[PDB]
């Protein structure tokens, strides 16, 4: 089997990625987060803290033929940039772009914080990072990529993330219309639940390639590109009046600039992210400073190829037994 997605952009500056999936029986259509950074798949719901919901569509179990309480289950979950949500577990049919798994875990939310409720465009998310990292308890609960896998013509998925526009999320099979040149792949570690890789270096704008290896995650629920300070202030420096801003929370820029290119290597490959990726507005209304996305990854603890660098690029992640990621120019 395989499935085939559109994904499209939550707002004029790609803040997110909003993907439709079809869960229960009728079908309930939600827009999740397709998030290679998490585990869990949850959604707003009728459960949800009523005042906790602000637009967002919500599955009502309830209404479902299909939908069974997983009982005893429970789930909570923090992300690194600080929101969280928690609720119960029922087990029902999820599809994603014709490709239907039976019997997955639809983590409910009984409780979201503010950053949730105020996303009007994300009804939830959906986890493809590796199970390991899954928050149900006390029975921990597989990712619709993991309980599709086997069925899958391949155990792949793809992320084809458009820049101001909308891209594909495909499971199963590789698009080979849908890049240029080859796929490089590279090794990934699984020891902390993401995928996990190594970058070989880097370049700012049409300077020369740093050979320097980057461990760092492949990340599609983050927004922006997390690396190391030494990185980061490199890239800045390359733009007049660009400062990093502890008020704002990062590099900010003028908004009357120019952005270079960043490159990141991929093997002997290279990924170019053009300098207008990089660029996320102005800070508030009407401010002529505007924010870099490029962002330094200390404090964080890990290094995040978020989807300013993913979007530059066809991302195959591959769930073989020996897990790869992939990467081609598009």
């Given at each position: ?35 290679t950074?998490?585990?869990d ?52 049919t ?21 950053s ?14 590796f ?10 609960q597989?990712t ?30 590789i ?34 390639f ?28 390359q ?27 991929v ?27 490029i ?34 120019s598009?």
């Amino acid at each position: 089997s395989t499935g085939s997605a559109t994904t499209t952009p939550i707002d004029s500056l790609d803040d997110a990625y909003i993907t439709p999936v079809q869960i229960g029986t009728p079908a309930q259509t939600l827009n999740l987060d397709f998030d290679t950074g998490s585990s869990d798949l949850w959604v707003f719901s009728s459960e949800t803290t009523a005042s906790e919901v602000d637009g967002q569509t919500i599955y009502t179990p309830s209404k479902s033929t299909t939908a069974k309480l997983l009982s005893g289950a429970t789930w909570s979950i923090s992300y690194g940039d600080g929101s969280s949500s928690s609720g119960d577990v029922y087990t029902d049919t999820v599809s994603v772009g014709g490709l239907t798994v039976t019997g997955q875990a639809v983590e409910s939310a009984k409780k979201v914080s503010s950053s949730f409720t105020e996303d009007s465009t994300i009804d939830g998310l959906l986890g493809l990072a590796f199970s390991t990292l899954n928050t149900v308890s006390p029975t921990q609960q597989k990712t619709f990529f993991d309980n599709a896998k086997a069925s899958l013509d391949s155990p792949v998925f793809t992320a084809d993330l458009g820049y101001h526009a909308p891209g594909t999320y495909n499971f199963g099979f590789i698009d080979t219309t849908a890049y240029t040149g080859s796929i490089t792949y590279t090794a990934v570690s699984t020891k902390q639940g993401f995928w996990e890789w190594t970058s070989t270096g880097y370049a700012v704008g049409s300077g020369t390639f740093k050979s320097t290896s980057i461990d760092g995650i492949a990340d599609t629920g983050t927004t922006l590109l997390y690396l190391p300070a030494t990185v980061v202030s490199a890239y800045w420096a390359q733009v007049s009046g660009a400062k990093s801003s502890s008020s704002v929370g990062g590099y900010v820029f003028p908004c009357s600039a120019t952005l270079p290119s960043f490159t990141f290597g991929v093997g002997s490959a290279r990924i170019v992210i053009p300098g207008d990726y990089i660029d996320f507005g102005p800070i508030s209304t009407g401010s002529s400073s505007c924010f870099g996305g490029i962002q330094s990854s200390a404090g964080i603890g890990i290094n995040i190829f978020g989807d300013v660098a993913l979007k530059a690029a066809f991302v195959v992640f591959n769930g073989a037994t020996t897990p790869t990621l992939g990467f081609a120019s598009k």
